[PDB]
Amino acid sequence: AGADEERAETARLSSFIGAIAIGDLVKSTLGPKGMDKILLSSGRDASLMVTNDGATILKNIGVDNPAAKVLVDMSRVQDDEVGDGTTSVTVLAAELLREAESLIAKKIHPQTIIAGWREATKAARQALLNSAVDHGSDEVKFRQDLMNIAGTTLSSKLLTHHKDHFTKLAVEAVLRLKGSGNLEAIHVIKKLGGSLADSYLDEGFLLDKKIGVNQPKRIENAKILIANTGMDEKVERILKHGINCFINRQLIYNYPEQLFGAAGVMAIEHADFVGVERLALVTGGEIASTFDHPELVKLGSCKLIEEVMIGEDKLIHFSGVALGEACTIVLRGATQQILDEAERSLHDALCVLAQTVKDSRTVYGGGCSEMLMAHAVTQLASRTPGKEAVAMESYAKALRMLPTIIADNAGYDSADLVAQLRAAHSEGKTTAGLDMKEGTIGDMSVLGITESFQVKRQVLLSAAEAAEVILRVDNIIKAAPR
Amino acid sequence: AGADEERAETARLSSFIGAIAIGDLVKSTLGPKGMDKILLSSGRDASLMVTNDGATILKNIGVDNPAAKVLVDMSRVQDDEVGDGTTSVTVLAAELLREAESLIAKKIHPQTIIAGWREATKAARQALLNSAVDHGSDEVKFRQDLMNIAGTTLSSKLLTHHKDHFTKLAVEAVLRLKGSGNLEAIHVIKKLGGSLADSYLDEGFLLDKKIGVNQPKRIENAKILIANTGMDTKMKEKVERILKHGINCFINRQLIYNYPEQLFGAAGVMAIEHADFVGVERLALVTGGEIASTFDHPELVKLGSCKLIEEVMIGEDKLIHFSGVALGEACTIVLRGATQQILDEAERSLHDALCVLAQTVKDSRTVYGGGCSEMLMAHAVTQLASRTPGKEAVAMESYAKALRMLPTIIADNAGYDSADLVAQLRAAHSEGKTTAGLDMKEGTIGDMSVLGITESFQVKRQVLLSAAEAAEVILRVDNIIKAAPR
Amino acid sequence: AGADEERAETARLSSFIGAIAIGDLVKSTLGPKGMDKILLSSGRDASLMVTNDGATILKNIGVDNPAAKVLVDMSRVQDDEVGDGTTSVTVLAAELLREAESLIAKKIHPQTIIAGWREATKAARQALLNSAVDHGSDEVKFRQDLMNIAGTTLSSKLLTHHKDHFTKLAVEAVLRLKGSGNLEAIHVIKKLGGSLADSYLDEGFLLDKKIGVNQPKRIENAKILIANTGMKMKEKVERILKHGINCFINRQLIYNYPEQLFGAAGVMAIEHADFVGVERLALVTGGEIASTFDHPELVKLGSCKLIEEVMIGEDKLIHFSGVALGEACTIVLRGATQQILDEAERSLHDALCVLAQTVKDSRTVYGGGCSEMLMAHAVTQLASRTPGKEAVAMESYAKALRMLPTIIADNAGYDSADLVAQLRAAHSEGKTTAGLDMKEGTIGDMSVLGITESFQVKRQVLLSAAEAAEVILRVDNIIKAAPR
Amino acid sequence: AGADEERAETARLSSFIGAIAIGDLVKSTLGPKGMDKILLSSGRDASLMVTNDGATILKNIGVDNPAAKVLVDMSRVQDDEVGDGTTSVTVLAAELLREAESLIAKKIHPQTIIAGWREATKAARQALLNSAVDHGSDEVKFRQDLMNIAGTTLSSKLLTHHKDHFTKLAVEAVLRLKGSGNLEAIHVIKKLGGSLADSYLDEGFLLDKKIGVNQPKRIENAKILIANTGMDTDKIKIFGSRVRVDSTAKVAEIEHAEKEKMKEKVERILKHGINCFINRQLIYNYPEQLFGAAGVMAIEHADFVGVERLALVTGGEIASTFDHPELVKLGSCKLIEEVMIGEDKLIHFSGVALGEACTIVLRGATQQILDEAERSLHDALCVLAQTVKDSRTVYGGGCSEMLMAHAVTQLASRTPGKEAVAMESYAKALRMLPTIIADNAGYDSADLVAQLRAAHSEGKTTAGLDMKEGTIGDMSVLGITESFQVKRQVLLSAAEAAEVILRVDNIIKAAPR
């Protein structure tokens, strides 16, 4: 028991097996016509879970002993930085292991081959520069704002009927974010109500809690009080300040509740901590401790806090923040499996194009980027010294699979597709790519599909470092089914 | 049962297996292209742990009943006097056990063989006075201060692409530090914020704790109180003594009772809960000190320096900085990096840098790095087996071949063919060029001095002694006996 | 499910197996280059500890069923009277068992062979009063007092690198001891401070304790108070001033309040002083009767020369001296400090017994196994001179002596057969000085080395080993009854 | 297969197995070259014990189901009446069972052979008649005081090199003991010093203990105090409770109360002039210091067995609570001192007024074996008391057994009918004893039997088995003789013991499963 040690072929084999198992399930997901899968697990899950998004299912379950979970864990950091849309990074890392069986013939030192990873880093920079990306997306923009990458992220998802409209909306949300402050303060929720738009845009922060039956219905020029310690002196400190609202992250004691109603102060019971922490940045903050917390120790913003009816049910909204560094997003849905999916999509949407204004650079979608890159990577291996080249040239044909997967989900024969694809990219037309609706090659730009430059730079480095940690290191292995 | 005693061949084997298991994992951890590993244990552990530094991982876990942990414990003491660079001493002791197969074929006396260790002492002797090593390091030093051994120590770490810059910084810290004032008060913490120039040197001491959100934002003309005894039990005496002094900050090394805390907020005094003792002792030197007793502590008995105590905001995470110390001889280093627990691999990386420089200025002696020292000693030792008596030569010659593996271990991580590397190396050393050594970036052999990598004189004398007793300790004892548990 | 059935050869087997297992572990230990063994246990045992002395480890534990612990127990009685040097007696008893196989070969009655023990007694006496051993243990003696046998006892042990110097010191200790009063009143400890000398010799009693930093430094015409019961302020002071009390020593925790009082008066107090030292102290100072605070004045007697605290090494020690009786004295040692230091406790104990025997005997034997080869040459002849039955038992004892040279040689690093060839030729010739030289790797002059063995150890061991071998040969029935 | 059902011959076998099992362990114990056996158990037993005396080991343990324990119990009465010598009685009863195999060869009525037990008595009359006994036991006696029976008991033990000298000493010890006193107060301890005599005789009693290193070296006109209770005070069985007082001030009273025990012990003890205090158990630390200044020697953990003999010696005292000093205590006074006996310190109690109780402290040549003196002295005590009372002895070394055996062979042929077979089997039983005595000697058993038998036939009662010789010799020259009582009682006991159970065929069932 305890620690383990590994031997020649068996050590490599443990890493090799992990990559192949995950590649096939993620494979159906890529491209406009991907398909959903449902998984049931060993007693800590409670029921059947279906996730279109590849990253969510891998994070939730550590099924077995082989090295995969650490590789998997990393994809979420990538999601944070950019990696989202359609899952492809995991697939890309996985086929690099197939090359290793070939490598046994390469009887020398496998670690020498490893030098290929920062050669690959050169390849990443070789790829970047060598490929016409884009020149549009100045800021805000009348039509290049979207109806582009979000649509492609959506394309792999069935929802894209009513849903593609939602994706367009996501860009308006980033438009209010641009400036100095970073990517923060975005929260999204869904509701039970049918509408063709299937969404509404809300100016303030969305919360849903109420003090009790009694209390003023609306508060004006509101002051906000946040307490770290539970309620389980208050009137005296309260009256001088002119407090209009109290928010506590936990259980609230019953006695003060009677007081607040007569005073004309609205309090919130068991408010969630995550909303509260964001709020402190928003209202100028407060010093949260024991009941001494009132007056100067705390700063309170004061526009308007009220409970409003959103089409249907009643909700409470915080708005008019002096700081201007934080905002909130509210979506209303018709209700279905794909609407809470918007939770999946908005989180992803935020990272993809907030980034897009910052980059001022994007690349053509639909696999246009991959074939062109494949064309120029082949020359580079030859250009570099030959043993360096052997590792570099293997990398170059790796890019070939992406074109094949995009077409395969479309419904057209893969062999013919690879053939027609290369000739257009080789010629020098960057706009041309894979048109799945056509089944052949077409103009990507007419479609409006473009990918953030960062998704391409970041995927390359993420795959290189993640791939590098495998082949390099022992300590793992797999045994038998279920 | 569980009595635990073994007979003849089997007993030797248990030690032999422990040495081989450890060597394969550690060899890959050596030098510039060295590798870090992840370890997972099912019981009473949270997740897989990854440690590049061999010494920290070996100390942490006592997985097996076979004797290995005892062997492991010995390297920390070495670390205090030096120990580090790249892990190697454990490897050298482990390879010694392989010749034991030869001993069975020897068919005479297992312990007459022990004479080889005596022979080894001569080997320790030869390395020390054979070869001209530094001639420089004439205190403080312009350019030659780093881009040397620290770079080699960091070599085993992936971070080196931007990390080598951090390594260079470490000697600057020793320049202010060095003298005989004391080898203490150097602290390292990493920050999850990124910039091109990773790592900043702070004027004073860096800490990360708060009484709570509660209390005033900053203090003026600060007075410092340190208490050995906890606040836990009284409120009245604490306020009375406090107000007269004007106390701006209270630091207690342990748990702090809640009642006084309300008082500090109203008064306008910032306190620190569960402050670590190591920071506190350093602080006393820094602040002029105090006599830390019971609540009789305030006023004259307490000495407190007063520049500024504040929470700045370095990058992302909030920290508290103590600076402007009147004494002037105790300073701290704050490291910044990309963002990983790997970045934490600074506490165990910095440590590697601090010990090396303090020893280097005073000893006025060093050895050439890159394995230059090892090949030279090896050439000299082969002769020795031939020139000394009867029993001594077989044992001694075997010891000599042990040195051969080190050239192999340094270039093995390179990716180049180890066999080709070993002989090319020997021809240059045999010739008489001490500067020449293994250049991993080159892939062949070159001039170590241009690189500037140098090993401290102390590292060579201790390793030789460490290797000698370490092999002996498992062997020296026969039939360990258990008396049946509680 | 009762008694336990062992017969003829099987009963012999339980004894036979016990001797073979013990001999190999003790075999490493016999000589200058012996090997250290450590045992690790859980429960009442803290951790790894190492004993170089075979006798200490064997009786601390009863590892298994086979009969041998009773045999082991006997060695300790020897240890008190003579004991140490190196542990060799257990090995000789073991040697006897291998010939037991030949006893079945003989095919008649094992009991007749017992006559061999009679023969052994006669053989033992031949090693005695034959040739000359040592002459001139003049008493006091400037050079022959040590740097001899004690060094041999030490050679097996680690401390010998600087300790052989310590060994020289011990004889000075025995010389003051001499008179009519066997061996008594000697107290010794170790110190955490390092020095080349590794030991200082005090003229009185050494005690390590301090009341506190405060309190007057010097006491004269000192009166000493020892109390059974632990440490109200006024009762202690009123009685104290009239007496003139200069010091207080108690074998337990002492109350803080009185401590403050002592400093003003000029009286020094001691907390938790060891009881054993106190019992010795009473004989030394004339003693007293210790009860509650009624204890001062006449019921207590206080001797008065000089009591002072002297900085020793780094640990601050106090000395009691100037005893009118003169009967009891104390020894102080300062070592390297590597837990091996607590080991020095082991080696010193060896020093009081070995040297004291040398003082009374005025006789010794050549060391390095010189005595054993000589006796072996004489004994081979003896077996033939006796008829036949008488012959076989006497000769088996004779060949037993051959292993001792062999055991000395085995730990040396040189094989036993070669050692045997050279060794016998030198002893046979007539040079008693010649013996086993372990550093040499061959044979040499023992006297030049300075290694000698007490005369008593050779005559008692011969009788001792013979009887020890007998205790189980006679008994062919070892019984355990009705489990649990 | 299994049920514990017995049928005809098998029932006989159960009696048979008990006899043979006991005989092999016992047989090696008989005579000069006897063997010691050591017995151990895990609990309700602490260590291996080795008993030379066959009777003592059998009494302590009832190992199994087959009958034999009751037969064993019989030798006890013999031991208190006449005692020991060598244990031979048990073996003789066992060999009676061996003929039984030949009995089924009879193929007839087994109980008419029982008449053999009626032949056993006839054999018994001749034992009285033919043996040659002795004439003389003057009282005290000059030359015939010993060198006789004590030596035969000793002969069985290998100590008979220097020891036969020690046996000779023992009669001097018995002469003072002799008469009215019965058996009490004889104590023996070894000394580690070599001498030809190997023994010394003391007028008083030796006890090995010391108060502590400090205390007066010697006391005279000594007064002795023995206490049933220790000097220790604090629990009382019923604690009186954890206890409640009135804070810390009164608890000072508790510590003070200890002093009162000290005060009573000194004040009362001083008036008497107390020289020596002996306590049978642990002694409280406070009093120990008091005794040293006073001039009084006390003994910590002095064991009780020495004390009871000591009490008879000093006239005794009534041991109770601290009121115990003065008159209720009678302390004889002559000399109590601790004397270096060259080797080890011991305390001598001497000058006892009673005179009845005395101690035989022997020095002798050293080894583990001097502890043998403990083994050997005990044998000496039992034989002399009987030797003085009987004034009759028979020749040892099996001389008695061969003579009787020669006579009985003739008897079988003379008696007609049913009776000779019964008589001859009893008669050949005697033959094994010469064999048992010879076998343990290590000499060949077969050779020994005929040569022995030929010498007896001549008419020499003195002639017997000489084990040291390996052949036959004159027992009388050796000086080995057995007391008259041991031979007449054993004959009656051996026959009767074996006789009942042969008679009964079937040890029956139970209820259970």
Side-chain angles (χ1 to χ4, degrees), chain C residues 250-269:
Chain C
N250 190 340
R251 188 249 120 196
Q252 43 191 269
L253 290 310
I254 190 160
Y255 216 46
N256 290 338
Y257 285 87
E259 299 299 300
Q260 186 171 270
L261 180 69
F262 281 90
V267 180
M268 180 180 56

Side-chain angles (χ1 to χ4, degrees), chain C residues 1-3 70 74 77 81 108-109 111-112 114 184 226-230 232 275 278-280 282-283 288-294 299 301 463 467 470-472 474-484, chain D residues 25 35-43 45 48 50 61 63 158 192 210 212-215 248-249 252 255-256 259 262-263 285-287 289-291 293-294 343 345 366-369 375 439-443:
Chain C
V70 300
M74 190 280 184
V77 70
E81 291 300 300
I108 295 20
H109 210 256
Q111 287 80 170
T112 300
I114 300 300
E184 290 177 278
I226 300 170
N228 290 340
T229 168
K232 290 91 170 176
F275 183 90
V278 170
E279 290 291 284
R280 290 180 180 131
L283 180 263
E288 58 207 12
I289 300 170
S291 320
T292 50
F293 300 92
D294 290 339
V299 300
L301 290 310
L463 290 170
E467 298 300 350
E470 290 180 274
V471 301
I472 0 240
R474 289 92 70 96
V475 176
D476 60 340
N477 190 35
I478 220 250
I479 300 300
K480 300 290 183 150
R484 180 60 180 151
Chain D
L25 290 310
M35 290 90 180
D36 290 308
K37 301 300 180 200
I38 60 170
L39 300 180
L40 230 190
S41 183
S42 65
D45 290 318
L48 300 90
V50 40
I61 190 166
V63 170
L158 218 249
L192 288 76
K210 190 180 180 176
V213 170
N214 69 70
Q215 254 90 39
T248 308
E255 190 170 70
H256 180 268
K259 300 299 150 264
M262 180 60 120
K263 291 295 190 62
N285 290 334
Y286 290 92
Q289 290 180 120
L290 180 65
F291 282 90
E343 192 70 20
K345 290 180 180 176
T366 70
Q367 61 256 130
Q368 181 180 90
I369 291 170
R375 180 194 299 163
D439 180 279
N440 51 42
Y443 290 90

Side-chain angles (χ1 to χ4, degrees), chain D residues 479-502:
Chain D
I480 291 170
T481 181
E482 290 180 350
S483 60
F484 181 90
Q485 289 72 40
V486 300
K487 290 300 180 182
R488 60 190 172 96
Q489 289 104 224
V490 51
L491 291 170
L492 290 171
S493 180
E496 190 70 21
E499 180 180 34
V500 42
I501 60 170
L502 180 150

Side-chain angles (χ1 to χ4, degrees), chain D residues 151-363:
Chain D
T152 193
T153 300
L154 270 70
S155 185
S156 70
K157 298 180 180 57
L158 218 249
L159 5 310
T160 30
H161 50 285
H162 283 150
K163 191 180 187 225
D164 49 286
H165 180 70
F166 290 65
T167 232
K168 181 250 187 176
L169 180 63
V171 280
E172 290 175 80
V174 310
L175 299 180
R176 63 190 180 248
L177 180 290
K178 180 190 286 280
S180 180
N182 190 210
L183 173 60
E184 289 180 90
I186 300 170
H187 184 70
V188 58
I189 300 170
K190 60 33 181 169
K191 189 70 32 176
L192 288 76
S195 70
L196 180 61
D198 290 310
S199 65
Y200 290 89
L201 190 279
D202 290 340
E203 70 287 294
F205 180 90
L206 283 170
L207 185 279
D208 183 290
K209 280 160 270 176
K210 190 180 180 176
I211 332 100
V213 170
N214 69 70
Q215 254 90 39
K217 181 66 64 195
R218 180 180 290 192
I219 60 170
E220 290 180 359
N221 300 310
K223 298 180 180 281
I224 300 108
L225 191 326
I226 300 170
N228 290 339
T229 176
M231 300 290 280
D232 290 340
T233 307
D234 79 55
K235 320 165 86 296
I236 230 210
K237 180 60 180 173
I238 58 170
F239 300 90
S241 260
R242 299 290 185 184
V243 124
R244 192 269 145 146
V245 192
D246 68 340
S247 300
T248 308
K250 290 180 180 298
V251 300
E253 180 180 350
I254 300 300
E255 190 170 70
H256 180 268
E258 180 60 30
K259 300 299 150 264
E260 180 61 10
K261 290 100 190 176
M262 180 60 120
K263 291 295 190 62
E264 70 180 350
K265 290 180 180 175
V266 56
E267 298 300 321
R268 290 180 189 333
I269 240 173
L270 180 61
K271 70 190 190 178
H272 196 204
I274 190 70
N275 290 100
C276 181
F277 180 90
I278 176 170
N279 190 340
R280 187 260 112 194
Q281 60 180 270
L282 290 310
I283 190 160
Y284 206 57
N285 290 334
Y286 290 92
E288 296 300 300
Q289 290 180 120
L290 180 65
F291 282 90
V296 180
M297 180 180 57
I299 300 170
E300 190 251 310
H301 200 270
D303 59 340
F304 188 90
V305 70
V307 170
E308 290 300 299
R309 290 171 170 84
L310 197 291
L312 199 235
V313 170
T314 160
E317 54 206 335
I318 300 301
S320 312
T321 312
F322 295 92
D323 290 340
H324 63 57
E326 60 145 8
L327 290 170
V328 306
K329 290 280 173 291
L330 338 246
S332 70
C333 57
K334 187 199 166 200
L335 180 60
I336 300 170
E337 60 180 349
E338 180 180 37
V339 180
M340 301 290 150
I341 300 300
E343 192 70 20
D344 190 350
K345 290 180 180 176
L346 280 70
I347 190 170
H348 290 84
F349 181 90
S350 66
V352 12
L354 180 70
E356 180 60 14
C358 299
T359 300
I360 320 190
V361 192
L362 319 150
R363 291 180 189 185

Side-chain angles (χ1 to χ4, degrees), chain B residues 10 31 56 89 99 170 187 219 269 277 311 331 470:
Chain B
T10 300
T56 300
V89 305
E99 290 80 10
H187 179 70
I219 60 170
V269 180
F277 181 90
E311 180 180 350
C331 296

Side-chain angles (χ1 to χ4, degrees), chain C residues 209-219 233 255-270 309 316:
Chain C
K209 290 180 180 296
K210 180 180 280 200
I211 0 80
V213 170
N214 60 70
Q215 257 88 67
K217 204 86 48 264
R218 265 259 216 248
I219 60 170
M233 180 61 120
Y255 216 46
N256 290 338
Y257 285 87
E259 299 299 300
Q260 186 171 270
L261 180 69
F262 281 90
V267 180
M268 180 180 56
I270 300 170
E309 180 180 89
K316 300 291 300 264

